[PDB]
Amino acid sequence: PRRLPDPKFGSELLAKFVNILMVDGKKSTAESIVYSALETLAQRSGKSELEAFEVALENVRPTVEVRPVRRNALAMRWIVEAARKRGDKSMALRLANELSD
Amino acid sequence: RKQVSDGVAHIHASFNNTIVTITDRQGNALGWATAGGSGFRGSRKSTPFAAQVAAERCADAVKEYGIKNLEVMVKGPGPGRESTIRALNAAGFRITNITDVTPIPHXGCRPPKKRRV
Amino acid sequence: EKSKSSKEQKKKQKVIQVKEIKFRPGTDEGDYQVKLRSLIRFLEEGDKAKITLRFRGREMAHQQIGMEVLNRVKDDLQELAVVESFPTKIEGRQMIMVLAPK
Amino acid sequence: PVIKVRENEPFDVALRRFKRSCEKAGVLAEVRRREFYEKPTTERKRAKASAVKRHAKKLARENA
RNA sequence: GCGGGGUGGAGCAGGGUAGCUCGUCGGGCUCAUAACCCGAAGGUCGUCGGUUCAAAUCCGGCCCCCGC
RNA sequence: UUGAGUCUCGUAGAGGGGGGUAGAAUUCCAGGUGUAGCGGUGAAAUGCGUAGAGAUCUGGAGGAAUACCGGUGGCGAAGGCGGCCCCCUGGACGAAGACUGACGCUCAGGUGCGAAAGCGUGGGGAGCAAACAGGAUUAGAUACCCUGGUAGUCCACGCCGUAAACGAUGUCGACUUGGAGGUUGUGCCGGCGUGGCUUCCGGAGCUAACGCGUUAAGUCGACCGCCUGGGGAGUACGGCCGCAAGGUUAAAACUCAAAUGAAUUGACGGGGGCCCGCACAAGCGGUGGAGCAUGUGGUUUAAUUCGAUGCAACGCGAAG
RNA sequence: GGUAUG
Ligand SMILES: NC(=O)OC[C@@H](O)C[C@H](NC(=O)[C@H]1NCCC[C@H]1O)C(=O)N[C@@H](Cc1c[nH]cn1)C(=O)N[C@H](C(=O)O)[C@H](O)c1c[nH]c(Cl)n1
Ligand SMILES: [K+]
Ligand SMILES: [K+]
Ligand SMILES: [K+]
Ligand SMILES: [K+]
Ligand SMILES: [K+]
Ligand SMILES: [Mg+2]
Ligand SMILES: [Mg+2]
Ligand SMILES: [Mg+2]
Ligand SMILES: [Mg+2]
Ligand SMILES: [Mg+2]
Ligand SMILES: [Mg+2]
Ligand SMILES: [Mg+2]
Ligand SMILES: [Mg+2]
Ligand SMILES: [Mg+2]
Ligand SMILES: [Mg+2]
Ligand SMILES: [Mg+2]
Ligand SMILES: [Mg+2]
């Protein structure tokens, strides 16, 4: 003004991602959607779940110059926004399909 | 057509518009291009970028004459003074002498009245 | 193309704009005549005139004062004008007679 | 402001020299003052206020 | 007599594919008002059909209506 | 002979009048090259351009003004005066003397000079530009803005006689602490003096205060001009002056109880400077659309009890 | 950044 690691992969970037996906404090609901999405992603790509997630972020990450914290924050926000718009049936698959694309 | 080794880039940089004209050394017109003719209209013309584009299209007009040397002759207080010559050098002409024309009366005629705005 | 010129000559066809003189329930003869003059001009120079009367606060309770002003304009601008529209109700606080060149 | 690019000089360095040649010579300031007519009383008034400012800054530099 | 046109209340755009202006109403903005901004309601488009895949559209009749 | 003049020698200066001339720039004309824009604004349009513009280059024509130097620099009674050169010409200042011997100061009336606009006659006319024409803007736009554009601006001669013609400060003389500069002489040995003009600050003193302050608005003397509440009014009438526009001299009735100056405290400013608050920005979730709850306005009613109304009334007094 | 009016 005028004046925590995600517990399944050790990436805080995914802990942030859970938080952006989360609605109404429902953090466990959010966690399941994202993990389900990452395993789905891995089965239809074939990496460790972060590499595919990070390649998916690289395509969205915007370059006034965006600095790298806002960059990944924007990317993840745009991914989640893009995912929620779609007509795939669950958010897990919406997220998996959006990440794939 | 004729080939010309060395040319002259006359940059009429007014406040509202930029005219870039490549001539021979004797001031015979080879090609010209303006910010107004570069898909900028109104006060879009009076930016450095619109002059930059006008320079590039002027360079493209005089590709056939096979010019590599240009002497620059910038004239006026226009926003696109330096952006033209920068973009002319980017086209790949070796800029020799860089020179400010700009007609100054030594007194001369009475100017129009000040705009009350 | 200088084609354009065709339009410039085309554009020497013409155009009517409507010009809006706002009267108030109690404007005085002097200013009436000034605004009346403005309209004569407007009209004679080939233009329409959205004449508006604009009741303010309680004045809305004597709308009939207003209507008399309009009716005076109609009756003065008689040989110059025909009265596209007259009002009867007082929507908002306004009465918006539109006159046109006879 | 005539700037021949000397034996083996970059453009960016050469452009800095040209812009500086114009800045010293007084071309953009000169064109702008000659854009609209200033009548002598305005000219003289402007020249007085500058002289007052210049001098008053020296008396602010002094007494300090 | 000869034509034009009949299009939301207003008037004016618009071979099929109806707006635009101002009313008209409500909202927003403001301390308040005008200005400004947004939304909605208003036509079936003179009528009668034929005719065109299309009827504001095309073609005629008719109602016209004023200009003349 | 100390005031006031004259002479000798030298100095600085946009002082004045006349003539000539230089370079830059705008416009225009004629060509060459060239090709679709140019110009303009807050945004546009009018306008200009394929009968070739704008741009660029060569040449020509014409008028007006003199960049830099340039300076709270200079000169002039004031108005004003700015390229360079010559001719004619006015004033100021310094150094030493020599000379005249109060020849002085001020000045009603008078006489002349007197920015710009304006007027008459005849020229001239690039640029600029009242009026005007068109294009915009707007509630309107007789404007501000845009494109054009006539008088005029320029010259000669004559007229006008006014300006915030201001230092809003009459002219002349004498006297009265200082400081820092500028400009222009001059003596003496960069320094040390000494004259003229001039800028800024400030002491006593003065002043309502602001301020002025050896260039006084201080302390005095000479002479002139002028003021006597505001508006009416620098108007009417009369005279004088002018071709005219108008100028100059200059009231009264009446009406008002004020008008006014400087400064103080606020407040305010589409004045400047520095800060803060979920004020904005960055976010996340809403309201505004739907249904319903609730309050209010309105309307209705026999009554729809009274109160709360921008922020700071409206699930508020009412916790039923 | 500039619109007026109580
Ligand atoms: N017309 C009416 O009755 O009302 C409208 C008027 O109030 C508009 C208002 N106008 C202005 O301030 C004038 N200032 C002087 C130059 C002209 C004009 O600009 C205005 O808002 N301007 C805008 C431009 C504009 C005009 N119409 C719509 N918009 C503007 O930018 N004004 C500037 C400002 O307010 O600082 C400035 O005055 C300006 C720049 N350029 C121009 Cl033109 N004007
Ligand atoms: K006498
Ligand atoms: K003229
Ligand atoms: K005091
Ligand atoms: K008289
Ligand atoms: K009296
Ligand atoms: Mg002088
Ligand atoms: Mg003067
Ligand atoms: Mg005297
Ligand atoms: Mg004159
Ligand atoms: Mg004359
Ligand atoms: Mg002009
Ligand atoms: Mg003009
Ligand atoms: Mg006087
Ligand atoms: Mg006086
Ligand atoms: Mg002082
Ligand atoms: Mg006094
Ligand atoms: Mg008089």
Numbering used by the authors:
A (entry chain G): 2 to 4, 13 to 72, 89 to 126
B (entry chain K): 13 to 129
C (entry chain J): 76 to 177
D (entry chain U): 2 to 65
Kindly provide excerpts from the paper associated with this entry.
During bacterial translation initiation, the 30S ribosomal subunit, initiation factors, and initiator tRNA define the reading frame of the mRNA. Upon correct decoding of the start codon by the initiator tRNA, the 30S head shifts from an open to a closed conformation, and the 30S-PIC transitions to a 30S initiation complex (30S-IC).
Interestingly, although the initiator tRNA can base pair with the start codon, the presence of GE blocks the canonical path of the mRNA in the closed form and prevents the initiator tRNA from displacing the CTD of IF3 from the 30S. Therefore, 50S joining cannot proceed because the clash between the IF3-CTD and 23S rRNA H69 remains, thereby preventing the association of the 50S. By contrast, GE appears to allow the transition and, unlike Ksg and Ede, actually stabilizes a closed conformation of the head where the initiator tRNA is accommodated at the P-site, i.e. forming codon-anticodon interactions with the start codon of the mRNA.
